[PDB]
Design a protein around this nucleic acid. Structure first.
Ligand SMILES: [K+]
Ligand SMILES: [K+]
Ligand SMILES: [K+]
Ligand SMILES: [K+]
Ligand SMILES: [K+]
Ligand SMILES: [Mg+2]
Ligand SMILES: [Mg+2]
Ligand SMILES: [Mg+2]
Ligand SMILES: [Mg+2]
Ligand SMILES: [Mg+2]
Ligand SMILES: [Mg+2]
Ligand SMILES: [Mg+2]
Ligand SMILES: [Mg+2]
Ligand SMILES: [Mg+2]
Ligand SMILES: [Mg+2]
Ligand SMILES: [Mg+2]
Ligand SMILES: [Mg+2]
Ligand SMILES: [Mg+2]
Ligand SMILES: [Mg+2]
Ligand SMILES: [Mg+2]
Ligand SMILES: [Mg+2]
Ligand SMILES: [Mg+2]
Ligand SMILES: [Mg+2]
Lengths: 88, 117, 124, 64, 88, 134, 372, 35, 96
RNA sequence: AAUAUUUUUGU
RNA sequence: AUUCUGUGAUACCUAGGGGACGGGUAAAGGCGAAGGCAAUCUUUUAUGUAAAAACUGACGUCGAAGGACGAAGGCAAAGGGAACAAAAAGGAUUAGAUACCCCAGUAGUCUUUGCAGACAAUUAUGAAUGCCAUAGGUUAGAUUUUUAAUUUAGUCUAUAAA
């Protein structure tokens, strides 16, 4: 600011303020949702030990297929009920 | 080639901004360049406090300069800026893809609009 | 006027609670071991709950529930104490200091690349 | 930019011919204070454009 | 963003747990009792209203099991049509 | 005045359950008022088309814009996935690179939005300050 | 030359199905919902019917017979076929009453569609030989372009910056040669004017000097130039120096084929009371109360703004079935995007009570019992 | 008339969920001690 | 003819770059005149010493989409003039 | 969700 | 447990340095002869792909040998040395434990100039040409009645004839 400068640090981006329609408990739920949407807890675990480029690559291929298979499965489950609703 | 330099200097003196913009400006024209525009941005916070030459800075005086000079001039322009202890940091970039059709639509540095390319 | 801070650092094996002033100077810097836990019980959820209650209790003895008008709760790490201490501040133990909270931030340290980490372990 | 002295000069001669200040429709209605002024203003502006375009199209200012 | 993939040929298109797993409600009341003792105390009066709720929970009769979900049957009808086929 | 105030709260509560903004010309049927339609099972407010193609701009040439970069990075400073931006792989690679150029050039933060943008957002007077400590 | 088998298919009924027209235009730079879609502004698929004798069997003239569960029981048999045979080997269909009955409701209001009016009400019909015309000739000048409604060129102010670039480069740039010829035809006519006028008391005009020079004379007057470019590309006029081009031309017919009535200047003769003053009211729902700076109401399936004035002030959960108020539809028009906007105007009191007399809802009947 | 029967069913769903959310708001904070 | 269409498109780019040569700077005389005019201690409404005061913020995505979704309101009149010109400049090539 | 005591042999 | 700490540690800050690393984006994605290549700016370098036109006119494919390139580790010389870590060394586990685990830790990893030429250097499938029926995704383009369908060159699943 004019006299005191803002503390620009990684925690500055991970900050949620208390307002009239957002109490303390409401700021925690907003934080947890944002801390999990950015996969912070996942980064701490992966950065605990080193994963060579080949293991980090093959690990993504395994997790990327399970994500595509799970997505295409929910689409077939909801497509089944969309057809079951038409009487098919 | 169409270049663009975003220089950040100390917020203390406004005269220091003129001498820097003029030194690099005359340098471009003497070599044979064509300055397209020079926007004077004010003094606002930096991405983070960075210390240069045993001096902690929290906000520098920004300024953009879009010129069309040769490679030798560009390197010489951004090399003198770096050596100058009055600049906090610089951001040089090559504008456009190199084609004439796109290089002819670069004018004033926009702030409330985009560079439609 | 920067608010007071209530840093809560917690990892797999211990938890630290530091209460600083606007200038970031520690006032109450305690850990689980300060209560009597020895080498294994500093990780338990219960120990982190007693530490939070002990720290908050010490804040009342120092008359900080009337001296602090604005406070910030900073969280670093995902250990068991991340939820234990929060529930203390979100219960009856921390009802006096709850009204003065204005911010809630996270200060977990991550590296974009950074220094090489230890090799994986083979426990099996 | 895949140009040459011929194409360059043609564009200049064309650009200046389509931007020349159109004179008044009639002579009695013409105003020498404005017509002669635009002639000098446009002429000076043309010299600047030519001097600026010649530097942009200079092949010595290109890359490998 | 890409759309859901067409699942490969599977042996059977089904969901492991068709009907949701019901959580014992009294386990949640016990957690509240253990919370009072942690903060208030064991031989206190603040846990009175909470301890009584724990006794009333274990006394009440458990609900009846819900009718099983027929999702897996409809998934088996549209498997060969939704996926690439059946494999065995 | 008590009944008047309590009625307002209960009224606004129901207004929150009508997850639909009726517009002029929108055709509605008796089914468009049932819970299934109002429940809003859709959990995604995704974009329609590639904004970089509708606005016809080159991201790489607009690295100066500090608001354009803060719009394509999460509050944590992480580039947004194509699911959120809803861009094509080519345009996503252009915006992803424009963010790295600006951050790499040192003109934009890498872990949060630009400070000057944090001054205009909520919590203006509650931003973390730096005490001189001396 | 077509075989007899190929000649019957051409005239068959299933081959007459119209292609699925694009959905009603929406904001390109906006967010929408993917896993859920509500009713559209106007229909995009053809609504089908079948004989009551064929409905008991599921035969709708499609690839396969439809199921009887979701197809029988309703009064009006309507269905929309999104795909006659999908990758699941099933006719992807859905009930079409969402738009089939909405047309019957609107047509029950007995109101025509009139051209939009800027704010002396002048309700002019849409189907008229002067305005409703799509064919034209190169002789009609700008003064007649205000009548047309179907233009070949796009609305510049509506197109996005990217859609405008594609137009300039791939539709406008490769037309200079043909446009220069367009000027020559005009210059050829100008030279004939003086010749004709002088004879009472054409030249080929192929010369690049006149064309190139003719354009240099219009640089000072850019207005007359735009009128010439628009005529070559068939653009919708934007600047007044008029045809309600503020929001742009319509993406369809001004009526959208929903109501073909031309005038509302009639008086329904009531049996007992006689010719009434205004048209019978219509009950309307109350959606999105003010406490949004405007209230929405559902009039015959459509959503329109409430009358310029309770039920509109605050929400009332106690009111069973929701707040419903009687109202009169004053004017109806189709905007550029294709929406059907209604100018719902508050209704009178006597009309409502009169409309209920034939229903049995009026508390005190107006006939006989009414002493004054 | 059909909209009434559907609007009523929505009202039942709204009041049920609204009341349900109140429990979530009160369950966030802890008051089991009954101070 | 195909080689003429390319040269023609190459010419238009030079005429465009010719019209934008009014704001360029070719000699030191225009340089010092430009610096002394824009670089002053009281140029950004001073109060405030930042471009974030006169022009509060740079155009964002929210604002951009609002120009084509929110409003569509009088910016069309200022935009149409700039668009109609671009259409005429393309066909006629006059670069008005 | 990121948890991990030990446990050999068989003409 | 060895170990760190009252010579004030951990925790929370301030101000100066110092090295190597590369978060998100990120995908069945892409690029090169392979090996292999993922922060960023400027400079620099050879192929390849799409669309049309124009040009040369069989100038093509494979290719022993020679030569060039060739991962990590390693040798040689001079730098650098935060982190990780063969070796050496200690603490535990265990019937025993060089081991797996732990406290610390040198070469080495990085830079520059050479040597070295072995790899599950893999698609366990040499390179190349002609040819054989479909479908569902996906990558970079092209065309269009750019809504959505054709189409060129790749890549990946599931099939027909075989
Ligand atoms: K110290
Ligand atoms: K390739
Ligand atoms: K170590
Ligand atoms: K060698
Ligand atoms: K394919
Ligand atoms: Mg301690
Ligand atoms: Mg180790
Ligand atoms: Mg073991
Ligand atoms: Mg044996
Ligand atoms: Mg460094
Ligand atoms: Mg490889
Ligand atoms: Mg990465
Ligand atoms: Mg060969
Ligand atoms: Mg060989
Ligand atoms: Mg080596
Ligand atoms: Mg080496
Ligand atoms: Mg050595
Ligand atoms: Mg040992
Ligand atoms: Mg190396
Ligand atoms: Mg290898
Ligand atoms: Mg070979
Ligand atoms: Mg691939
Ligand atoms: Mg296969």
């Amino acid at each position: 600011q004019q006299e005191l400068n803002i503390r620009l640090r990684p925690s500055t981006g991970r900050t949620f303020y208390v307002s009239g329609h957002q109490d303390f408990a409401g700021a925690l739920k907003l934080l947890h949702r944002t801390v999990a949407a950015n996969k912070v807890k996942k980064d701490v675990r992966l950065q605990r030990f080193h994963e060579r480029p080949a293991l980090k690559r093959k690990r993504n291929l395994r997790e990327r297929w399970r994500a595509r298979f799970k997505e295409g499965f929910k689409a077939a489950v909801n497509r089944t009920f969309e057809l079951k609703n038409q009487g098919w | 080639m169409l270049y663009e330099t975003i220089g950040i200097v100390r917020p203390g003196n406004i005269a220091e901004v003129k001498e820097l913009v003029l030194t690099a400006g005359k340098l471009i024209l003497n070599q044979g360049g064509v300055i397209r525009d020079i926007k004077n941005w004010g003094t606002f916070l930096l991405p983070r406090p960075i210390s240069t030459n045993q001096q902690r800075h929290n906000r520098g005086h920004y300024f953009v300069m879009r010129y069309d000079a040769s490679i030798a001039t560009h390197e010489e322009v951004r090399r003198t800026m770096k050596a100058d202890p009055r600049v906090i940091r610089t951001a040089n970039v090559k504008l456009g893809d190199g084609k004439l059709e796109t290089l002819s639509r670069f004018g004033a540095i926009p702030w409330r609009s985009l560079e439609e390319a | 006027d920067e608010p007071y801070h209530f840093h809560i650092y917690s990892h797999k094996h211990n938890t630290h609670i530091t209460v600083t002033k606007p200038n970031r100077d520690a006032l109450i810097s305690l850990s689980c071991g300060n209560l009597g836990f020895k080498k294994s019980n500093r990780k338990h959820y219960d120990s982190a709950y007693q530490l939070g209650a002990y720290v908050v209790d010490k804040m009342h003895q120092m008359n900080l529930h009337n001296k602090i008008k604005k406070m910030e709760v900073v969280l670093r790490g995902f250990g068991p104490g991340r939820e234990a201490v929060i529930k203390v501040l979100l219960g009856n133990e921390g009802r006096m200091l709850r009204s003065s909270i204005v911010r809630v931030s996270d200060a977990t340290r991550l590296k974009f690349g950074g220094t090489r980490s230890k090799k994986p372990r083979r426990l099996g | 930019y895949l140009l040459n002295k011929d194409e360059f000069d043609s564009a200049i001669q064309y650009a200046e011919h389509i931007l020349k200040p159109i004179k008044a429709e009639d002579r009695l209605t013409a105003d020498p204070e404005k017509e002669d002024e635009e002639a000098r203003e446009h002429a000076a502006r043309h010299a600047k454009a030519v001097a600026a375009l010649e530097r942009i199209a200079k092949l010595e200012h290109g890359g490998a | 963003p890409n759309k859901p993939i067409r699942l490969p040929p599977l042996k059977q298109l089904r969901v492991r747990q068709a009907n949701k797993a019901e959580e014992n409600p009294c386990i949640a009341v016990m957690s509240s009792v253990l919370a009072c003792w942690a903060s208030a105390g064991y031989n206190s009066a603040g846990c009175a209203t909470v301890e009584n709720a724990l006794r009333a929970c274990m006394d009440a009769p458990k609900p009846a099991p819900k009718p099983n979900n027929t999702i897996n049957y409809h998934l088996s009808r549209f498997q060969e049509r939704l996926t690439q086929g059946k494999s065995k | 005045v008590q009944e008047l105030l309590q009625s307002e709260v209960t009224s606004n509560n129901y207004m929150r359950m009508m997850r639909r903004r009726w517009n002029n010309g929108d055709v509605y049927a008796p089914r468009d008022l049932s819970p299934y339609e109002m429940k809003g099972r859709n959990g995604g407010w995704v974009e329609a088309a590639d904004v970089v193609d509708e606005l016809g701009f080159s991201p790489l040439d607009n690295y100066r814009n500090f608001s354009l970069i803060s719009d394509y990075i999460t509050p944590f400073g992480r580039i947004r996935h194509s699911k959120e931006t809803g861009l094509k792989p080519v345009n996503q690679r252009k915006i992803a690179k424009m963010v790295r150029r600006a951050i790499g050039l040192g003109i934009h933060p890498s872990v949060h939005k630009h400070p000057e943008i944090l001054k205009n957002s909520n919590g203006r007077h509650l931003l973390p300050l730096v005490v001189p400590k001396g | 030359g077509v075989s007899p088998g190929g000649a019957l298919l051409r005239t068959s009924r299933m081959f007459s199905l119209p292609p699925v027209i694009p959905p009603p235009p929406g904001n390109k730079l906006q967010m929408i919902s993917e896993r859920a879609s509500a009713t559209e502004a106007y229909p995009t698929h053809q609504v089908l019917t079948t004989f009551e004798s064929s409905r008991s069997r599921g035969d709708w003239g499609l690839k396969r017979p439809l199921p009887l569960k979701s197809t029988t029981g309703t009064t009006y048999p309507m269905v929309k076929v999104k795909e006659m045979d999908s990758l699941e080997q099933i006719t992807d269909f859905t009930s079409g009453t969402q738009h089939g009955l909405t047309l019957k409701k609107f047509q029950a209001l007995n109101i025509p569609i009139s051209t939009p009016s800027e704010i002396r009400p002048v309700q002019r019909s849409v189907f008229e030989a002067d305005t409703d015309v799509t064919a034209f000739s190169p002789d009609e000048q700008i003064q007649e372009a205000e009548k047309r409604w179907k233009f070949s060129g796009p609305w510049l102010a509506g197109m996005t910056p990217g859609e405008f670039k594609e137009y300039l480069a791939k539709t406008v740039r490769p037309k200079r040669a043909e446009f220069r010829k367009f000027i020559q035809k005009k210059i050829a006519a100008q030279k004939t004017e003086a010749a004709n006028r002088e004879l009472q008391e054409k030249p080929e005009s192929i010369t690049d000097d006149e064309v190139t020079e003719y354009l240099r004379r219009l640089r000072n007057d850019n207005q007359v130039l735009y009128d010439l470019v628009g005529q070559f590309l068939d653009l919708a006029p934007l600047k007044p120096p008029s045809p309600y081009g503020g929001r742009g031309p319509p993406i369809t017919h001004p009526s959208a084929g929903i109501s073909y009535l031309r005038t509302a200047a009639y008086l329904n003769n009531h049996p007992i009371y006689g010719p009434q003053k205004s048209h019978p009211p219509v009950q309307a729902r109350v959606l999105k109360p003010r406490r949004g700076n405007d209230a929405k109401i559902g009039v015959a399936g459509f959503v329109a703004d409430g009358p310029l004035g309770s039920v509109m002030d605050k929400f009332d959960p106690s009111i069973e079935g929701g707040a419903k108020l009687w109202v009169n539809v004053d004017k109806a028009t189709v905007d550029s995007t294709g929406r059907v906007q209604l100018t719902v105007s508050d209704a009178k009191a006597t009309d409502v009570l009169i409309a209920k007399e034939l229903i049995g809802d009026a508390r005190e009947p107006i006939f006989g019992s009414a002493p004054k | 008339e059909l909209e009434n029967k559907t609007y009523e069913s929505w009202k039942k769903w709204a009041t049920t969920e609204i009341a349900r959310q109140e429990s979530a708001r009160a369950s966030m904070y802890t008051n089991v001690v009954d101070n | 003819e195909k080689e003429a269409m390319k040269s023609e498109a190459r010419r238009d780019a030079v005429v465009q770059l010719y019209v934008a040569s009014k704001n360029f700077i070719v000699d030191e005389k225009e340089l010092e005149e430009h610096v002394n005019k824009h670089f002053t201690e009281k140029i950004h409404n001073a109060s405030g010493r930042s471009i974030w005061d006169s022009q509060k913020n740079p155009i964002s995505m929210r604002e951009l989409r609002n120009e084509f979704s929110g409003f569509n309101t009088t910016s069309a009149a200022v935009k149409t003039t700039v668009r109609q010109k671009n259409v005429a400049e393309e066909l006629t090539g006059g670069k008005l």
